[PDB]
Amino acid sequence: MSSLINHAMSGLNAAQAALNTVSNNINNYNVAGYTRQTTILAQANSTLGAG
Amino acid sequence: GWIGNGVYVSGVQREYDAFITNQLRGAQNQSSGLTTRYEQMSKIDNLLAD
């Protein structure tokens, strides 16, 4: 079922968000302050059925 | 009666809000005031900078 494209979408947007975060951080590297920002992700922890 | 009774559509909706939007509007207004004053001030400063 569409679960596969959903998997792909989850991965795509997760990588996309993390990439935006790292871009922000790498261009902000020398602001007057601004500790690094790190991204956190985890399993869907749910969303499963038969078996 | 014919039991499959096909799908129908529940309208179309947008993703936004009223109250938080209004708070947004107030914030933007204040910031516009500060921007106006800063640029007007920068004008005097550019001459005085010399």
């Binding site: 569409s2 | 014919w2 039991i3 499959g4 009774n5 096909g6 799908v7």
Partner: protein, 51 residues
Amino acid sequence: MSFSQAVSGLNAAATNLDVIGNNIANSATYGFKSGTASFADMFAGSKVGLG
């Protein structure tokens, strides 16, 4: 009747097709759960009954 056996079966198969079509029609309805129908043998009197 042999004929009735078939007719009944054909008719039932029409119902199965209807439920399958509805399954597809709901194939993205949020939270939806899939459906199917259940058959039984119209044995009565003796032999095979009617279908």
